[PDB]
Design a protein around this nucleic acid. Structure first.
Ligand SMILES: [Zn+2]
Ligand SMILES: [Zn+2]
Ligand SMILES: [Zn+2]
Lengths: 89, 196, 55, 129, 223
RNA sequence: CGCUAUUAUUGGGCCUAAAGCGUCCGUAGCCGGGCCCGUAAGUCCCUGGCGAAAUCCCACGGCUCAACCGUGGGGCUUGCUGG
RNA sequence: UCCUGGCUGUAAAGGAUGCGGGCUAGGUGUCGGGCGAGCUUCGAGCUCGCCCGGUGCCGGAGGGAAGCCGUUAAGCCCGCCGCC
């Protein structure tokens, strides 16, 4: 067997030289005063993780499913990205 | 009962078909002679003629086309136009009368009449492209493709074409109420025919 | 709005289709729709009011 | 030779619908075919099917109304549990509730919605949409 | 604004153009599901004034073709262009010319004449909302050697497809989709026509009156 | 590894581009018409005993947050077995 | 090259198209069998129509990169074997 190795927490784009992505990331970098693209990319990865969790949980039947739903909603409310009376959509 | 005494139909030759046939015409077909010739029923002809009369009377007169590439159908069509105020194109139907607005005589009608869907395959196609209903006289060898009303009739006889368009004009005028009753229509059947 | 339905089959009429519509040549209260498929395949239609059963 | 009459029936239906027919005759009849037709009637894809009796077997006479896009038999008849339906949904249907998987259970032939409500699985035999 | 600017210097040649200019046809949806022929781009310029904005006029492909003669080679330009209201109406056109401007203009005119409307919805297993941000069910399209299959996706999944499909679906008003393809997708004309036909085939799927509220189906413009 | 539906169960192709045996009869094997009764081996449901920990997902808490560690809840363990 | 009795086992051995089964418009020829009408020089004869099976030419939807195929599929389904 092979043991564990720690893995990155950010993703890179599939193509490095697309004009639209370049322009958008340029604007964001400038208007939020970032140093690199790693920061932008890892915030985007946070978002994508939230979005995948929602897509998975949606229409899943059981008990752990609803537990995880409420966990997600409470975590978002605590972070400050959603109000209290919110839903999975 | 009938629009015309049956023997007149018979002497004109409305019940005379080809030596061919088609599954789509088994309804209108009635018999097969010992010669190979097929015979059409005249009741259905009468009924479809009445129905076509009502249908065309429900239309604006001057938006109606009558087309006959055949030679024995150019004069009947011309007099149908004269009697009903409808347009008639005897000869050729220059391709583009309906699809090309840059020709001399460009028109867009509401309904089309056809003497043979096999010879008049150009007008039929343009009419299909512009999306209008079609009334066609059909014989035993004809199909019913892209045809919304069919009149079973011998298409090649001059007497038959003359009698058919005569009846049609009479019925259209009646249902339009330009006349009170039949026999108020004093045009003779010997005018619609092609001269020699 | 509302999408018309063919009288022979029960399918909706598509936008750029070569379909047609007219008034029943027998009675005159219903409207007959015909899609390109029934027109090219000679599929028979029938009036909903009186059942004229045209071509 | 003749292996499966259900597939023949369903394909005959698809072709006749695609070409614009009113009635459909199914010569080798069975009881699965009747049950499948019953489900399809309850869900609203056909009308007025009846059984005719000749000395060989039955014949089925069906009326179509224009509410079918596709229909077919699932081979091989896969076993399925009450926990793995979305897979075969995504595989045989175009949207999340669009059409019917037809399942054969120890309580009879049914749709997968009913089977899931009851909490059971079975074997897959057909799909319609 | 420029309604009296586009409607005053136009004389109709056909009967649909006259119907539109007089004022008896007033909405874009009244010209489609009849057997009407469209032989004037001013009809669409009147009923959809948004297709005239330059930001709704993607030019897709420009090619240079050669015909041999004993003198030399005769050159022609072919331009494939796309037009569309961003709320359910799209058009695709091809134009030929002895130079590039003539070809572009003819392509945009033929794109205006080839206008279709589409249906939108959600239809995804992972979103299940009722908002017309995608197509409501998977559809198929074919052209030449190219086969395309479109599937609905969840919100925020933006247009997983090649760039020609990206631009056509963006002009259609669609925002989320998954795709599969087969064939010579490097030929832009066939890929574009296959995606156009896929978008057209949303009108070919039969539905029941209970599906319109499950998927939030919208025909043409929304709201 | 993916790109590659260029190894294709999902999911490819064999007139002309690679590709139907020269044609037939048949062994194993795979596929097999309609109704009725039985059994319950496959299949389905409920439950008992097992599939070490670390690793994987989620929430909370402790090192400035994190990476890391801890408490708990789930999966993984391609499954075996008693009713 | 022909006859008798044996070996070899190959070809553009080509419909360059593996075999079985159900379905998706038809038209017109020809071959065999059967049925029904009319002619007859009374012929196992002539003509017309229908059902079944073989073999050809056209052709609409439909299919295909196209040429073209198109109920004798190169179309949609249920199967097995050979090959790339
Ligand atoms: Zn129809
Ligand atoms: Zn009526
Ligand atoms: Zn959605």
């Amino acid at each position: 067997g092979d043991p564990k190795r720690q893995r990155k927490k950010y993703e890179t784009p599939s193509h490095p030289w697309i004009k639209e992505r370049l322009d958008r990331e340029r604007v964001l970098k400038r208007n939020y005063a970032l140093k690199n693209k790693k920061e932008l990319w890892r915030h985007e990865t946070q978002l994508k993780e939230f979005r995948r969790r929602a897509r998975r949980l949606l229409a899943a039947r059981g008990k752990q499913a609803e537990i995880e739903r409420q966990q997600l909603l409470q975590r978002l409310y605590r972070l400050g990205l959603l109000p209290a009376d919110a839903v999975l959509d | 009962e009938y629009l015309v005494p049956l023997d007149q139909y018979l002497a004109a030759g409305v019940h005379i078909g080809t030596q061919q046939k088609t599954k789509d015409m088994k309804k209108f077909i009635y018999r097969v002679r010992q010669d190979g010739l097929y015979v059409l029923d005249v009741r259905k002809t009468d009924e479809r003629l009445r129905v076509a009369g009502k249908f065309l009377a429900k239309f604006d007169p001057e938006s109606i086309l009558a087309v006959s590439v055949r030679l024995y159908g150019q004069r009947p069509v011309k007099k149908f136009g004269e009697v009903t105020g409808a347009k008639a194109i005897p000869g050729r139907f220059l391709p583009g009368t309906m699809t090309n607005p840059q020709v001399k005589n460009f028109i867009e009608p509401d309904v089309l009449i056809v003497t043979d869907p096999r010879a008049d395959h150009q007008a039929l196609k343009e009419a299909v492209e512009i999306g209008i209903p079609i009334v066609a006289l059909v014989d035993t060898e004809n199909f019913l493709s892209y045809v919304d009303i069919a009149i079973p009739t011998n298409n090649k006889g001059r007497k038959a074409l003359a009698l058919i368009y005569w009846i049609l004009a009479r019925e259209v005028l009646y249902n339009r109420k330009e006349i009170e009753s039949r026999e108020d229509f004093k045009i003779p059947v010997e005018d619609f025919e092609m001269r020699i | 709005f509302e999408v018309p339905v063919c009288t022979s089959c029960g399918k909706e009429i598509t936008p750029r289709e070569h379909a047609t519509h007219f008034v029943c040549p027998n009675c005159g209260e219903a409207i007959i729709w015909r899609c390109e498929s029934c027109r090219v395949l000679s599929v028979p239609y029938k009036c909903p009011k009186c059942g004229w059963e045209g071509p | 030779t003749l292996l499966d009459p259900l597939a023949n029936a369903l394909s005959h239906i698809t072709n006749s619908e695609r070409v614009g027919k009113k009635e459909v005759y199914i010569k080798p009849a069975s009881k699965l075919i009747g049950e499948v037709l019953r489900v399809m009637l309850e869900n609203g894809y056909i009308g007025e099917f009846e059984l005719i009796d000749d000395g060989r077997a039955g014949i089925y006479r069906v009326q179509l109304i224009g509410k079918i896009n596709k229909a077919g038999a699932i081979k091989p008849r896969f076993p399925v549990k009450a926990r793995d339906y979305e897979k075969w949904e995504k595989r045989f249907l175009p949207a999340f509730e669009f059409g019917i998987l037809i399942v054969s259970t120890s309580q009879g032939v049914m749709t997968h919605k009913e089977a899931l409500e009851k909490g059971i699985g079975g074997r897959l035999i057909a799909y319609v949409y | 604004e420029i309604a009296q600017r586009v409607l005053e210097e136009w004389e109709p040649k056909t009967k649909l153009g006259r119907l539109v200019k007089e004022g008896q046809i007033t909405d874009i949806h009244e010209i489609f599901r009849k057997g009407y022929q469209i032989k004037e781009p001013e009809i669409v310029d009147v009923l959809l004034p948004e297709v005239n904005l330059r930001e709704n006029q993607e030019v897709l492909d420009i090619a240079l073709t050669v015909r041999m003669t004993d003198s030399g080679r005769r050159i022609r330009f072919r331009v494939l262009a796309a037009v569309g209201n961003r709320d359910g109406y799209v058009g695709l056109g091809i134009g030929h010319g002895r130079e590039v401007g003539i070809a572009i203009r003819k392509a945009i005119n033929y794109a205006k004449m080839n206008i279709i409307e589409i249906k939108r919805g959600c239809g995804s297993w992972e979103c299940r909302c009722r908002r017309p941000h995608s197509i409501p069910f998977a559809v198929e399209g074919k052209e030449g050697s190219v086969r395309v299959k479109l599937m609905p996706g969840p919100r925020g999944l933006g247009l997983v497809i090649g760039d020609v499909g990206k631009k056509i679906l963006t002009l259609a008003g669609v925002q989320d989709v998954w795709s599969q393809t087969l064939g010579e997708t490097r030929t832009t004309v066939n890929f574009a026509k296959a995606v156009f036909n896929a978008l057209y085939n949303t009108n070919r799927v039969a539905i029941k009156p209970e599906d319109i509220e499950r998927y939030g189906i919208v025909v043409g413009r929304a709201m």
